[PDB]
Design a binder for this molecule. Structure first.
Ligand SMILES: O=c1ccn([C@@H]2O[C@H](COP(=O)(O)OP(=O)(O)O)[C@@H](O)[C@H]2O)c(=O)[nH]1
Ligand SMILES: CC(=O)N[C@@H]1[C@@H](O)[C@H](O)[C@@H](CO)O[C@H]1O
Ligand SMILES: CC(=O)N[C@@H]1[C@@H](O)[C@H](O)[C@@H](CO)O[C@H]1O
Ligand SMILES: *[C@@H]1O[C@H](CO)[C@@H](O)[C@H](O)[C@H]1NC(C)=O
Length: 720
C-alpha cells in the first residue's frame, strides 16, 4: 500500500576481472575480451570468453566475466550458472558474488542479492563495487541513510568512482542534503563530460539529468546511450525487420493503437489516464493495452482491462522477442511508450520496432534520445520549437496541453464544498474548515441557518457545527447527523480504503480542517506537495524571499521523505526564517492528499522539476499554482497546465515575477479571492480535466500521424 510515484530505473555496477599469472593463452583471451566489452563489441567479447573457457575450462575469471556480459544481454539464467561455476572453482571470488547479486536483483530476488552482496563484502571488505551495489539496494528500499553510508565507503575505497558518486548525488537530493551543492553540481557535469568523451555509459540516469545543470546536448546524449543499452539486449535475438501495415483494411478502417505501461495499477499514470481507453471512439479506433506489470488487485487495473478493446499482460511474456511478436501480430499502427526510462520499462520492445509509428507519451518527462521512437507527444507551451533540438524525437503537438488527469471522474466529491464560520462573526474563510460530499446539498437542505455566499454555503456556529468540530478535536472516525454520515478527513481508510486510494468515490461527507494539520487559521498558507528531491537551494531561497514579504504566512511541505525535513529546516533558518515558518505533514492517501489541497491558499511550484501529477492534484482543489517555466520539459509542465486552465497570470517569466505574483496573493486578499475563484471555476469549464475532449484531440493527432505515414513520409513535426 506504499504510495507509487515516478521513479527511475534501478542500477548496478558490474566489475570486470583481470586474469594474470594464469594460462597465457587464456589470460590473453579473457583480458582481450575485457577490452572489447569496454568498446561495446559484446558479441566479440562473448566469443573470446568462450574460447578462453574452451582453452581453460576451470577459468574462474572467464566464467564470471562471461556471465556479466550475458547478464547484460538479458541472459540471466545463463549468467547465474556461470557465476556459480566461478565460485565453485574459487570460493573466495568476491567479484563473482557481487556480480551475481546484480543478476538476482534483476530477477527481483532482493533477499538474494543482499546475501550475495554481503558475502562479497565479507570476503573482501575493501571491495568498492560491492559497497556501491549494496548501497543501491538500500536506496531502492528507501533506506537512504544507509545507502549514503555505503556509497561513502565505496568512494573512500575508490575515489574515482562515478556510479557511486552520482548515486550518492541522487541520494543527497532526495533528502535535501545540500552540503557542497555547488561543488557537487560541478563534479557531476565533469563526470558526464568525461564519460561521454570516453564512450562510456554515463553514471547519471536520464531521469536524474533533469535535476542537474547539464547542457541539453548532454541530457540528450545521456538518454541516447541508455537507448543503446536496449539494442544489445535485442541484437542477440537476431530478429528481422517486421513488416508493417500500410492501410487500415485489415482493421476495418479502425486505427490500431497500443499503450504500453508498467503502470496500469495504483500508479500516477493510471490516476491520470485510466479513463482514456474507454473514451476512444470504437468506430475509428481499436485499443490494445499492453501491461508490463502483473495485476495489483486495484480498481485501476480492473477498469483499464475492462474498458480497453484488448488487454495483454506482457507480464507473462518475459521474452522480449515474443512480446514484440505479439504486438506485431496485433497489427498495431501506433505504439505508445508510457514509461521512458522509468521503473518497469521494457524499451526493448520499442527497439524491435513492432509498429510503424512509435510515440512517447505522458509517463516520462524527457526525450528517449533514441532512434526507435518517432515522436514525443507534447504541447506548444511545454515544448516550443525553439528547443526541439533538446529532443531526439519529432514533436507532435496537442492543442492545449499534453497533460491530463482523471480527477473529474475520481474525485467528484470535490466539485462542491461548504464551510463552517467558526470565528465566527468576523471573517468568512473558504479554507479553514471544509466539507465535501456527494450528499452535501442534501445535508444542507436539512439545515435552515446555512448561509449562501457567492457560490459557497456557510454553516454557522451551530449545535451541528459544534458537534463536527468536536469530532475532529476528539479524533472520532465519523458521526451521524440527521441520518447523514459526517466523517473525519483523517480517517477515510478506516471507513473505506478504496475511497482513500481513489479506487472509489467516497460515500460520506468529509471534514477537512487546518487544525488537523497544524496549520494557522490567521495566516496565508503556501504549499508544495512534491517529493523533496524537486527542491534545490535556489528554490528555497526564492520561497524564503516570498515568505519574508508576507508576515504571518507559512510554507506547507511533506515528509517525502521524512529524513528530509531537518535539512530543510536548517537551511531555511540560515536564510530566514524561524522554524515555525515551515510546516510539514506526512504523505497521505491519494484522496486525502487531493482534498487537503483546499486548505492551502496558494501553491508554489517547483522550478527545477515542476509538479506534474501533483500540479493537477493541486488545481483540482481550486488552489492557484505559481510557476516559472524553464528550459527542460519537466520544468515547463505546470505552465502548460495553467495555460490550458486559463490563468496566464500565474505564470512567471523570471524569479522576480514569481516572487511578486506570490506576494500579491499573500497580501491582497481580494485578488486572492478572485484568482482562487477563477481556478475553482475553470477546472470545470476548462479543457484541463476534460478527458473526453482530450481523447478526442488525441485521436486527431494520431490520424495526422497515420496519414503522414501512409503517404510514405518519414516522421516530421506535427504542429497542424
Ligand atoms: O500525500 C500525498 C502526496 C502525493 N501523492 C501522490 O504521490 C504521487 C507523486 O508522484 P510523482 O512524485 O511521480 O508526482 P509527479 O512528478 O507526477 O507530480 C502522485 O500520484 C501524488 O498524487 C499522494 O498520493 N499523497
Ligand atoms: C523518493 C524515492 O525514493 N525515489 C526513487 C529512488 O529512491 C530510486 O532509486 C528509484 C527507483 O528504483 O527512483 C525513484
Ligand atoms: C535495470 C533494472 O531492471 N533494475 C532493477 C530491477 O530489475 C529490480 O527488479 C529492482 C529491485 O530493487 O531494482 C532495479
Ligand atoms: C510520474 O508519472 C506521471 C505519469 O506517468 C508522469 O506524467 C510524470 O511526469 C512522472 N513524474 C516524473 C517526475 O517523472
Amino acid at each position: 500500500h506504499h504510495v507509487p510515484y515516478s521513479s527511475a530505473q534501478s542500477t548496478s555496477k558490474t566489475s570486470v576481472t583481470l586474469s594474470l599469472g594464469g594460462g597465457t593463452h587464456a589470460d590473453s583471451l579473457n583480458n582481450l575480451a575485457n577490452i572489447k566489452r569496454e568498446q561495446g563489441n559484446i558479441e566479440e567479447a562473448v566469443r573470446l570468453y568462450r574460447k578462453a573457457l574452451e582453452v581453460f575450462p576451470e577459468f574462474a575469471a572467464a566464467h564470471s566475466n562471461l556471465a556479466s556480459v550475458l547478464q547484460q544481454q538479458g541472459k540471466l539464467q545463463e549468467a547465474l550458472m556461470h557465476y556459480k561455476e566461478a565460485i565453485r572453482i574459487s570460493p573466495t571470488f568476491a567479484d563473482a558474488y557481487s556480480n551475481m547479486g546484480n543478476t538476482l536483483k534483476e530477477m527481483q530476488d532482493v533477499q538474494g542479492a543482499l546475501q550475495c552482496y554481503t558475502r562479497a563484502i565479507q570476503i573482501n571488505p575493501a571491495f568498492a563495487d560491492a559497497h556501491s551495489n549494496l548501497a543501491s539496494i538500500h536506496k531502492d528500499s528507501g533506506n537512504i541513510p544507509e545507502a549514503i553510508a555505503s556509497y561513502r565507503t565505496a568512494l573512500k575505497l575508490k575515489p574515482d568512482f562515478p556510479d557511486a558518486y552520482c548515486n550518492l548525488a541522487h541520494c543527497l537530493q532526495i533528502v535535501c542534503d545540500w552540503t557542497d551543492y555547488d561543488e557537487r553540481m560541478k563534479k557531476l557535469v565533469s563526470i558526464v563530460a568525461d564519460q561521454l568523451e570516453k564512450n562510456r555509459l554515463p553514471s547519471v540516469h536520464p531521469h536524474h539529468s533533469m535535476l542537474y545543470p547539464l547542457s541539453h546536448g548532454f541530457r540528450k546524449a545521456i538518454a541516447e546511450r541508455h537507448g543503446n543499452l536496449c539494442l544489445d539486449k535485442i541484437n542477440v535475438l537476431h530478429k528481422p525487420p517486421y513488416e508493417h501495415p500500410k492501410d487500415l483494411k485489415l482493421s476495418d478502417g479502425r486505427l490500431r493503437v497500443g499503450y504500453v505501461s508498467s503502470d496500469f495499477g495504483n500508479h500516477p499514470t493510471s490516476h491520470l489516464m485510466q479513463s482514456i481507453p474507454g473514451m476512444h471512439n470504437p468506430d475509428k479506433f481499436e485499443v490494445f493495452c499492453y501491461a508490463l506489470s502483473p495485476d495489483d488487485g486495484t480498481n485501476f487495473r480492473v477498469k483499464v482491462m475492462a474498458e480497453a478493446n484488448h488487454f495483454i499482460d506482457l507480464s507473462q511474456i518475459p521474452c522480449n522477442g515474443k512480446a514484440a511478436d505479439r504486438i506485431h501480430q496485433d497489427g498495431i499502427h501506433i505504439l505508445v511508450n508510457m514509461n521512458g526510462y522509468t521503473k518497469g520499462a521494457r524499451n526493448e520492445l520499442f527497439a524491435l520496432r513492432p509498429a510503424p509509428i512509435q510515440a512517447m507519451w505522458l509517463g516520462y518527462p524527457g526525450t528517449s534520445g533514441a532512434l526507435f521512437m518517432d515522436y514525443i507527444i507534447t504541447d506548444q507551451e511545454t515544448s516550443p520549437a525553439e528547443v526541439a533540438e533538446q529532443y531526439s524525437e519529432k514533436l507532435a503537438y496537442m492543442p492545449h496541453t499534453f497533460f491530463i488527469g482523471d480527477h473529474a471522474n475520481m474525485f467528484p466529491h470535490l466539485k462542491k464544498k461548504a464551510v463552517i464560520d467558526f470565528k465566527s462573526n468576523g471573517h468568512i474563510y473558504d479554507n479553514r474548515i471544509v466539507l465535501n460530499g456527494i450528499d452535501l446539498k442534501a445535508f444542507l437542505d436539512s439545515l435552515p441557518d446555512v448561509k449562501i455566499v457567492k457560490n459557497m454555503p456557510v454553516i454557522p456556529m451551530n449545535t451541528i457545527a459544534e458537534a463536527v468540530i468536536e469530532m475532529i478535536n476528539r479524533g472520532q472516525i465519523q458521526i451521524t447527523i440527521n441520518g447523514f454520515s459526517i466523517s473525519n478527513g483523517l480517517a477515510t481508510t478506516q471507513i473505506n480504503n478504496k475511497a482513500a486510494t481513489g479506487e472509489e468515490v467516497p460515500r460520506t461527507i468529509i471534514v477537512t480542517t487546518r487544525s488537523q494539520y497544524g496549520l494557522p487559521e490567521d495566516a496565508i498558507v503556501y504549499c508544495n506537495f512534491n517529493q523533496l528531491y524537486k527542491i534545490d537551494p535556489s528554490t528555497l531561497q526564492m520561497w524564503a524571499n516570498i515568505l519574508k514579504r508576507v508576515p504571518n504566512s507559512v510554507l506547507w511541505l511533506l515528509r517525502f521523505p521524512a529524513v528530509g525535513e531537518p535539512n530543510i529546516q536548517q537551511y531555511a533558518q540560515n536564510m530566514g526564517l524561524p522554524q515555525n515558518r515551515i510546516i510539514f505533514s506526512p504523505v497521505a492517501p491519494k484522496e486525502e492528499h487531493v482534498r487537503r489541497g483546499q486548505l492551502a491558499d496558494v501553491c508554489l511550484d517547483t522550478p527545477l522539476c515542476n509538479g506534474h501529477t501533483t500540479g493537477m492534484d493541486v488545481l483540482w482543489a481550486g488552489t492557484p499554482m505559481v510557476t516559472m517555466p524553464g528550459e527542460t520539459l519537466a520544468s515547463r509542465v505546470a505552465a502548460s497546465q495553467l495555460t490550458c486552465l486559463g490563468c496566464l497570470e500565474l505564470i512567471a517569466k523570471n524569479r522576480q515575477e514569481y516572487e511578486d505574483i506570490a506576494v500579491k496573493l499573500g497580501t491582497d486578499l481580494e485578488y486572492l479571492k478572485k484568482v482562487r475563484g477563477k481556478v475553482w471555476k475553470q477546472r470545470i469549464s476548462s479543457p484541463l480535466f476534460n478527458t473526453k475532449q482530450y481523447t478526442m484531440e488525441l485521436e486527431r493527432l494520431y490520424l495526422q500521424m497515420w496519414e503522414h505515414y501512409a503517404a510514405g513520409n518519414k516522421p516530421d513535426h506535427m504542429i497542424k
